[PDB]
Write a protein that binds this DNA or RNA. Sequence first.
RNA 1: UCUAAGGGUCGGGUACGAUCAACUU
RNA 2: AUUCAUAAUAACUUUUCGAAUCGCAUGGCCUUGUGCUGGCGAUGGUUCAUUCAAAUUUCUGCCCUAUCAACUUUCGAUGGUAGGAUAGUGGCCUACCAUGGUUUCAACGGGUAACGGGGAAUAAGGGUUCGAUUCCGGAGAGGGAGCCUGAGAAACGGCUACC
RNA 3: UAUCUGGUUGAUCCUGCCAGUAGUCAUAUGCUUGUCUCAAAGAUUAAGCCAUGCAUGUCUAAGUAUAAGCAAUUUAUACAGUGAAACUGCGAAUGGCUCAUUAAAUCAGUUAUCGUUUAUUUGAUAGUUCCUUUACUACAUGGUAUAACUGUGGUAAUUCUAGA
Lengths: 188, 260, 113, 155
Amino acid sequence: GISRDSRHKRSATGAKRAQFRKKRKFELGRQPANTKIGAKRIHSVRTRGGNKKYRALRIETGNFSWASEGISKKTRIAGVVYHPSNNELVRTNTLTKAAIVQIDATPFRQWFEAHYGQTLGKKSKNAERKWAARAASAKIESSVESQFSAGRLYACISSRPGQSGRCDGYILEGEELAFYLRRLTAKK
Amino acid sequence: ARGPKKHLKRLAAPHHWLLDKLSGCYAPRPSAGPHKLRESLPLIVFLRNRLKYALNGREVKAILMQRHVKVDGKVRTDTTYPAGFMDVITLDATNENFRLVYDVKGRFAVHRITDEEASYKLGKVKKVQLGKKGVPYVVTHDGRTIRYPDPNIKVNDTVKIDLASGKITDFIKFDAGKLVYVTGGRNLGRIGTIVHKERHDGGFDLVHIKDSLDNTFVTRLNNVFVIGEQGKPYISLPKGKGIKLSIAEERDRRRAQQGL
Amino acid sequence: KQGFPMKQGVLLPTRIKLLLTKNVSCYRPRRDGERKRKSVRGAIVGPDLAVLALVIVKKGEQELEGLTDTTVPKRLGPKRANNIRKFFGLSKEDDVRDFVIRREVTKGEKTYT
Amino acid sequence: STELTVQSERAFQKQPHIFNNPKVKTSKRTKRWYKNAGLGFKTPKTAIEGSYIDKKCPFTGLVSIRGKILTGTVVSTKMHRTIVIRRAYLHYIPKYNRYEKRHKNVPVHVSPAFRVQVGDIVTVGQCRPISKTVRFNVVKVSAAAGKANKQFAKF
RNA sequence: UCUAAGGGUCGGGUACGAUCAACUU
RNA sequence: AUUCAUAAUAACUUUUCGAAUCGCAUGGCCUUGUGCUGGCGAUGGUUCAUUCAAAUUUCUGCCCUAUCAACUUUCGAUGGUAGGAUAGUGGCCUACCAUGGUUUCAACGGGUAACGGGGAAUAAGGGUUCGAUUCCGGAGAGGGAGCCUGAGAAACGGCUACC
RNA sequence: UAUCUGGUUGAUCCUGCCAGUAGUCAUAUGCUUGUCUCAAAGAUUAAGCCAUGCAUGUCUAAGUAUAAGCAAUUUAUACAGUGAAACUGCGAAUGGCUCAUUAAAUCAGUUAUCGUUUAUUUGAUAGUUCCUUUACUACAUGGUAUAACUGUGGUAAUUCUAGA
């Protein structure tokens, strides 16, 4: 099939190499699937040594980390355009690693309110003790606090969904967030 | 290609089994085991070719399928079981405990030992790591994992193993003034009391050795194996003591030794 | 005619060659993973057939000289304990060692089982 | 050098799993990762103090030098973060009991911890494959100039 | 239905912003 | 020499594994019940390590031809960033970007009555010629291509198609 | 065992080839052929390929046997001896054969995987799982199909197979 080999390419001198071996399953390459949003659909592919890989098609949820606070929460994910990668093997408006996405923000809102006793945007003895103790930290950033108004947070995917089957990631914060939206002009 | 070889031809088998080549056909391929293919001795070879207790592979199999012979306190009814260096072979017939050691020419010396000496064996630690749940382990040359050892057992040291409980009784460090039994190389079977060591980061640590005859030589640390202190080995050594009397001395012996 | 069997789902009733795998009818794999292309007739009935196969669901008024006149028995009984249990309706604790069925065989004039 | 300013590319360039928390007001604002590549190769101050990323760098990146260490003369600097060195040697022909000059050209990755110029001698180390042709990385430089710039100033 | 690229005039407390308009690929 | 081994936090999984298995021996203790305990093994099983390996890989090295001197980049040539794929590295594959890379120290192309070596023949010495082979490893199973199963095959005394 | 000889001329010395001479695990062919030991052998030409005719499966005290098979255990009324078949599990990816393609490509030696997979061997290694975690249950251990088998059939035919 797709030979993930170099004997077919060319020499660095420009020399045309001879077809030297019938293709080998060592040198094997496979066809992607266009991990889209919606209606979780995961197919398992057998790999070398057994070793199931979980090719994701059309995920809907993901697990996103909020590292300045040091937690992770499940959310639903939202729009995409990617990639600036391919023409041959993957096709359609996918979701992948290093992609910037919008996520639900409600579990983080709930967690923040219950963990600091403080809202974003716009009781009991134990809870008050805890909030007063771990106060002087609910001061994150203008950008994130502004995102919570809309209720949709910019995050980056760190997992490779076509290999693992997940949409784990991390919420953008700091210089990344200052950097990113001048980009994302892509299909395929 | 297409998977691993199961056969092994006469001429490809290591020279220290001593059989015959030209279309003599096949040789016994050591099965996977604690030791490597080349640095090992299968039981078929140990029994048919060295001890002459058997004449044929079916005789060897008839032996092995009676729980007569055991390697390291365990039976090993496999014909091509790779037995190796410092391995204890125990036959209740004659109550003969055989240690596999090296003669000076590089063959496998058939050392006969006492039961008290067969109680244990020795092992060179290859790596020391932490396993899961923070449990340290050492790996020896015979693929033996030992958990929770003394924390001073660093790499290339050697270890005394009780062979019924896979436990450690005592360890010997790698340092100058320590005996060594060379395993592998040109200088295989020599015993020579480490002089010093040469580091060569990224470059195959070398060791300088000195026999009792003050015949200094040099080997590779992967091929070195410590066994004790100056003049106090931990094993009964074979006939020869790892000296390598030159060919001239050898003929002088076997002409003046004996007119038979 | 020509002997090719019929297969469910295979409309366009003609002998069509069709890949076949395991866990599916009209092919017995010889090796693991062996697939094979075999001519198979469709499911729709027509004049080109030679043998149909019919299963009596409802019994009519009459009775037949091969089918309904006779009653061939089940050869083997259950070999599993709980299946014997469901068969004989004992259902808790009732020592299947004696409830399981026997089969005397006449090896000769003197017969064990 | 390298005028990536630091972030010339369309993706954000960072060291992976190197996290600078905006919460903790650390009085550096400069969190980097570097390593001693080993073998007595000195880690440069340009790498420790710099801002570049270069995942293929043997000091701040993820590659590791292992295997061979070679030397050569830079005969090209026209690619980005890689060079070509000349490795000259003499091959013996026994029939004639004599030698003949031979060269192999060897492409090398160069970090922006090094200001490399055509003519400079450079010591390189074997890395994993990082391109079709590249398997080596610059780990030391020796400039064969003495900064002989004013010798051109003649009046 | 989109994407990209290709410009003008103003600003520099002695790296870039604001504003304006074409068609071509 | 590491972002190593390992551990700990937050969660994540369509949720893996954590014996409904088998043979011989039948013993020990009492509250004598087909009661409670218990041996020697077999097979299977998660991870780690080892072994047999495999895949990639560094350096150097191969015959004749200049009546082959300029090749490569076209729809990848050389590199960079990111992604995808892969068991994994890597233009392996593509997106964007740059314009590099090899060459009279013989590139590229052509030829080989060319598988490569260990080795063989003949030689004072130097050497010339041979090496389809009884070891080693590369390939191939009429030609091509594709793929299932599996730890391992692009398998052919295995499938699929075309010739 | 570091060897040379014949041929240009009327004759000489040269250059220089031709010819001879010896060997060949280098082939062929011709003549001849008593013995012992050792023995290569469709490579060259057609990787036309032999285009005929025959062959790689496998079980132990220890996965499943109501064979409507044997013998008989006489220790047994559930089996418990042997054992065709078939399911399961391993193996068939080794070996053997050939040299077509192949000129930095295989390959040799030398490295590396801090760049990965690894059945099997070998050694270590799972008190943590009743998901409403006090009835929710079988844990003295729960569920379903299906083969072989019985019998009805198709086709001229194949290691074809259908229905019950």
